[PDB]
Design a binder for this molecule. Structure first.
Ligand code: COD
Ligand code: COD
Ligand code: COD
Ligand code: COD
Ligand code: COD
Ligand code: COD
Lengths: 155, 155, 155, 155, 154, 155
């Protein structure tokens, strides 16, 4: 069960909160895949290639994390990796009922596939991606919110 | 009262959750109108015609159910049908304060018009149209979440 | 479904919000039973006998409304009345997920039994028995929040 | 803290609930600035020019209120005004975790800045701009929802 | 309106989050009454008198704050103080709807009486009295959650 | 983190939802401690010693599960076991903000301690102990809600 975990998200862009989830889940799983979803339907600020790149940069220090981009269904991805656990992060503005709904839906698509939830550090519990984007977009400084190593990309 | 209720939605597509609500509310009113709102402001995956046709098939065997598409205010639709009851379904990811707000906005518009809520079966309380569309858009199989009569259409 | 609904509650005391729901739901069923549960496990300010008398006085003028006190499981009460509908009132402080949970817990005990929800008028949608008790217990005037018929008794 | 507050919003259009907050919060600070954000990401129905004008019109008779439009970060706006108070209104469908989040995001951008919350009158605690927009989109009458002096600009 | 604000609560015990609210709201009002309710029905861990002393001690450095104990209805207290503003704090576990409901109920009991909300610092937004009492009762150290000067009292 | 998890609760009585969480988290750590708290402040229907015994009986077939009763702080308990992870289950009626609060309060008391959340089967996601207690108290049958093993010890 601990062989491999998938932490999937849009990561638009990766923030300090995402990093705390990667930092702790990567302890539990021998390998942690960070799966960056295309999510074209959301309308991401940063492209799929830019978002993959930021998150690869911000996760170099984790030796067992590999980041991939993917365009299909997450449940099938997991089936490809032989993965039986999706990792999600829970924070203050988490839509908790939607997390449960998506966990059951992913399990109904792949009967092997569990969802497990982590928490970020308390300081980072109020960080969301959409605030970061709002800050960037009105040309403000969001460097206290996202890993310093991606800042020159999002600046 | 008793003589007619209207269960309005975007139904994009109709799911086993919406069918549960039709099944139950159709027991309480002589006639249940299933009303498919244009809802162009959301950006439905399926056209108004496709969504009417699908809910018509999935409701073929409910004797007292009649499906219609409409473009204007639901409050005015009710008035047209001499209807003083709107039907809504409550489920796990319902925005419950939004439901209340919509019910008082509707009564605002048509002073005789009450809102009444039913629940789906426990199995279908976690089904949402957006998860179903996310599945369908990423090539997944959503036939376990929508009535069998529509699968030839949404695939 | 059309002939009898039970609106069950502690009613400690009955409030303007509870009357709203009786008014509304009594329009939808041939008969509405207002069932006052013992609920001795809460620690009702008013006795079962007082809560029944209170709700009897405040409902005296509704033609199809009958009030009863009961001690056992509401699902068994419904069965005794050949009733397949439980009535609940949804308001601003409602614990919405607990409502669903109770609805399904009721159905698991009596497989025929559905729960249906009504709203009170907007003015009364913030009224709670808890606040009315707190007012009354701290010597304040609660008469704007409960039916006038009962005010003689709660003071 | 006593001298000035800024009530920021997209105001699309200004409704009776916004006005309540303006009335209430204008009573707590020597000067209130009503700041209309561009908010181009929310795709407003009404342009920034029209929303400024409508709020000016609706606020004309408050002695200590001035309205401004702004394109930049609200936290730098408050800096400009030597303001350490952001005013927000709390209503039934407020997403409360996200208000807290935004208050700490504003404070993480300008360290002296607090967010203070007021409530509207109870009758207006259910009004949202989203519902006004849906009403007028569907050429219904939302005149009971927005101040008389803006109605002709929105018909 | 800025003359006097009342910040009411059970304060069982006062925590760091309460003090953040007192710190900010005492900037807006020329006098801040911190009103310690008896709150019998909630079965406080600490007696009314003990709660009153802890909070008086924790708030002595705020020169325009006075703490009082009260047993009646808060809307009636505000009336005797000529106060038109109740101060409440909002945090992560706040029952938001219950705040709105009690704001309207206090308004319906006193027509001039508004409710205004503040936030604590982010580090203190997850502090609750009940978590403090849990720690105290199972004999752990909560000194990081309450003002340290009240620690020997608790 | 991979070696041990502690799933702490009042377990009053153990229900099919808790068993789901025990099944699931036991697949994620090499040992699972099911820790029965005294919780004298809650007012448990069953004594510590009954709730220990029922949970032992209900978990006797999980090979890597140990049940213990404890009176002190969970965070010290975790220390004494060289355990970095508390397991919690998330269900429909979870108070989500209070979980996150308790996770940060536990981590305040033992700086290495993480909280991880599992979901029960969808069918048991509406089961709570309080509703089981209510059924038992009112002499109804709650044997569909708690493991067969403990049913004799409940009625
Ligand atoms: C993209 C998916 C994973 C949704 O991801 P989401 O939009 O939530 O991504 P996002 O970048 O916002 O967040 C990433 C993860 O970190 C969590 N998180 C976000 N901010 C924080 C923070 N400050 N702290 C801790 N966790 C956080 C989120 O809860 C999530 O777990 C989902 O849409 C998906 O699976 N898409 C693929 C197609 C598919 O299979 N959909 C069918 C799903 S049933
Ligand atoms: C279309 C309307 C009714 C909103 O519908 P909504 O977007 O909620 O439709 P949707 O298809 O998502 O849901 C339909 C109904 O099924 C319920 N439901 C959805 N999924 C489920 C499920 N699994 N189980 C049970 N019920 C469910 C919904 O709560 C709703 O009651 C509304 O926007 C409307 O009235 N539009 C017309 C214009 C108008 O008058 N607007 C003014 C509103 S004041
Ligand atoms: C007594 C029962 C129904 C729960 O009642 P509850 O405590 O919600 O009673 P209360 O008097 O608070 O409310 C009565 C009803 O009016 C609603 N309501 C309350 N205030 C308002 C208001 N201002 N406006 C509209 N509705 C209102 C409640 O939501 C409920 O629908 C329940 O505990 C029960 O069924 N007891 C019997 C034993 C049993 O069978 N329990 C098993 C449950 S699985
Ligand atoms: C525009 C801002 C303030 C968000 O505003 P919002 O979308 O909430 O505006 P809106 O017009 O919807 O509401 C205005 C205010 O009235 C409140 N409100 C709305 N309806 C009601 C009602 N019926 N009663 C009481 N209050 C109400 C809202 O809660 C809000 O406080 C925010 O996007 C912002 O600051 N933008 C500027 C750029 C910036 O600095 N962004 C980064 C933020 S970290
Ligand atoms: C005691 C009253 C004020 C309610 O108090 P409450 O239980 O919320 O007190 P508590 O001690 O828990 O909290 C005190 C205040 O600080 C806030 N708060 C608590 N923790 C924190 C924190 N970490 N950060 C910020 N604020 C916080 C609470 O929201 C509240 O604003 C109410 O019961 C009351 O008025 N009682 C008197 C009788 C009365 O008039 N009742 C009728 C009311 S309609
Ligand atoms: C006892 C503790 C763990 C709280 O337990 P709680 O009251 O939640 O136990 P309860 O028996 O309700 O539930 C047990 C666990 O199963 C979960 N759960 C309950 N029902 C279900 C269900 N249907 N499905 C899934 N999970 C469920 C609960 O969420 C919880 O995770 C807490 O009080 C504690 O740690 N006490 C020890 C003293 C201590 O250290 N306290 C200070 C904490 S900061």
């Amino acid at each position: 069960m601990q062989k491999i975990g998938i932490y999937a998200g849009t990561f638009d862009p990766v923030t300090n909160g995402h990093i705390d989830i990667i930092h702790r889940s990567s302890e539990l799983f021998e390998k942690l895949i960070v799966a960056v979803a295309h999510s074209s339907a959301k309308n991401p600020m940063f492209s799929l290639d830019e978002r993959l790149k930021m998150i690869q940069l911000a996760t170099k220090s984790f030796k067992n994390v590999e980041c991939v981009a993917f365009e299909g269904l997450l449940a099938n991805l997991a089936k490809e990796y032989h993965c039986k656990v999706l990792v999600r992060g829970l924070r203050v503005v988490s839509d908790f009922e939607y997390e449960l709904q998506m966990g059951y839906a992913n399990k109904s698509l792949n009967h092997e596939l569990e969802t497990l939830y982590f928490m970020p550090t308390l300081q980072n519990a109020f960080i969301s991606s959409s605030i970061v984007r709002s800050i960037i977009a009105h040309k403000g400084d969001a460097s206290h919110l996202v890993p310093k190593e991606i800042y020159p990309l999002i600046s």
